């Protein structure tokens, strides 16, 4: 149900906590069944929370560009409400859909209905809400030779032609106010411009100055200190599993790094882990 959620805190990698609301099991299954019953329109540029297309593809969409820009939607999930969903459906019996889809974080606000990050159905509705937003933004971008993707609160644009992304921020805002009234809003504090002169990266994947995806020198040094420790067996159980997971991540994003690590010490060492 809308109130059938459980709230908790998960910490942050630097300081502070984040508040999550995982649904109950029965409504979890009900919303999964609803997701299966009707598939929602989704734009290709939304390379997040879909089969196959992962972080690597979203970051590689901008590999072959030298000027990078992006903005972060302010309070993405919690802004979506019944009105946004139904306007999106109309633009292209219904009360139980409202009940199943949404969350009520306040005991008194029966109408304060929003998507939670925990909800397994939240990704599908989030992608569905911006089907025309992505349509128009990508149409404009490709009209001006701009590659645009969105990793779920990370609207990324890239291009090679100088002084074109400058108008893109404003564009975004305008379109937003046409589509979702004035409810969902951008985060002007996070908007970042970068070039081949600074530290570009999309969704955590670094983009080096040679138009290839990379783990970044930071990690490439961190999980090689970890490997040098494993060489002398100075890790632990959880730490060793952490190194294994990080090596798997580096294999997925930058297989060349794994090959070079193998050449560094051996093949059997990484088969062991």
């Amino acid at each position: 149900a809308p109130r059938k959620y459980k709230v908790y805190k998960i910490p942050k990698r630097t300081t502070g906590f984040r508040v999550i609301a995982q649904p109950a099991k029965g409504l979890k299954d009900i919303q999964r069944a609803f997701v299966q019953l009707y598939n929602f329109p989704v734009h290709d540029a939304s390379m997040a929370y879909m089969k196959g297309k992962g972080i690597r593809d979203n970051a590689a969409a901008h590999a072959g560009n030298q000027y990078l820009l992006k903005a972060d939607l302010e309070d993405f999930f919690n802004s979506i409400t019944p009105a946004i969903f139904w306007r999106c459906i109309e633009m292209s019996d219904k009360f139980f859909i409202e009940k199943i889809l949404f969350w009520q974080p306040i005991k008194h606000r029966k109408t304060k209905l929003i998507l939670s990050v925990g909800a397994p159905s939240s990704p599908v509705i989030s992608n569905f809400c911006m089907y025309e937003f992505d349509n128009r933004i990508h149409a404009a971008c490709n009209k001006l030779e701009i590659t645009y993707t969105r990793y779920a609160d990370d609207l990324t644009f890239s291009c090679n032609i100088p002084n074109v992304l400058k108008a893109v921020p404003s564009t975004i805002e305008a379109l937003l106010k046409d589509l979702f009234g004035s409810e969902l809003r951008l985060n002007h504090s996070k908007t970042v411009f970068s070039s081949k002169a600074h530290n570009r990266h999309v969704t955590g994947v670094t983009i080096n100055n040679e138009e290839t995806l990379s783990l970044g020198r930071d990690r490439k040094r961190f999980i090689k200190h970890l490997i040098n420790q494993y060489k002398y067996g100075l890790l632990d159980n959880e730490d060793k599993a952490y190194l294994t997971g990080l090596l798997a991540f580096a294999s997925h994003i930058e297989p060349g790094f794994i090959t070079r690590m193998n050449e560094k010490y051996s093949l059997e060492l990484m088969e062991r882990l």
Binding site: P11, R13, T14, T15, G16, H188, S189, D218, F222, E238, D239, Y242
Partner: protein, 389 residues
Amino acid sequence: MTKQYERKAKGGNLLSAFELYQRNTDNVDEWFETCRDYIQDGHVDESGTFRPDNAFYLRRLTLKDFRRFSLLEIKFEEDLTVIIGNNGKGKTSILYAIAKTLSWFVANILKEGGSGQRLSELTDIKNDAENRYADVSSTFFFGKGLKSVPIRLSRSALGTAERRDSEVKPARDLADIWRVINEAKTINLPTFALYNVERSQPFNRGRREERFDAYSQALGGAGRFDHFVEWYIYLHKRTISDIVTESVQKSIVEKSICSVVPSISKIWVEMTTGSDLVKVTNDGHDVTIDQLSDGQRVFLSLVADLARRMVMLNPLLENPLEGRGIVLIDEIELHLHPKWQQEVILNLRSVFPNIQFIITTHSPIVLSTIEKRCIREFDPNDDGNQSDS
């Protein structure tokens, strides 16, 4: 997660190291040292000037719907940024917003959970705006560890039933680090000042020897030359003796004042009468501060407040004037003869080197030797209501 914070702090992330300090041994000897050396490390370069290993300095301001502006961005140069325009554009609103964002730093170094200044729901939101709320977003920088410290002083318009929370929590966190580390062991704190037009006032006629009175009425606009005179008399009384860091503080402020202000060559305190008044050797004639002119008095009431706030806020720094901070000045040309206007900044940013001066002016002759990277210029036609020079 002791492990993830451990990894971050070992990388160099200051926030994770401080969080480890707040969990271990505090209900450790390693993470406390990391956090303190992060905010205490530095080197003396060729020019004999202490330089931080991590520099604290504003980086970006974004005024969304704030007074005249509907959107603006200033890459505060890290060190000197003179916003040259002319009346009606908003060079005072920028410093007002910056001071009100630094007020949270000051409030949360005064006391955890403190409260800083706030935008106004009557005079800070653009009247033509459709949002009916103003947002002063900002981002500071404090080194590789805390490369980005966001803040957002936001305020809705009076009568609109839609508040707008302010995101000051990162400021709370960084100020928490400063204050807690200062308590555990003495460190050097950041200086924050606002010298707007209100610093021009008649020379009318707390303990003043603390270290946290450097923050009293620091972002109001006038400074406190009353407090400076009181504290300087205090220093004189405490350091006559034979005729001590009080003596060194006194000498530092004396040299600062006698160097920045050209008319003033000496300054001391006399009590051969029953008054205990300050004498200034202005223009070669010994006088009192009441007898000083309007441009020899503010040019003193600025440098004196700054030097005071920076000797008794950077106690361990060999030269306290080299400490860090963010100083706003709203009209550097106030009451100053044009010849004075032509060398104000060249000397102001020569005895306060590591300070980020966000200065504003309308006299194009202030920008005499100032590099073009430091100048932000609202075009007379393309007025300030558009997102440099």
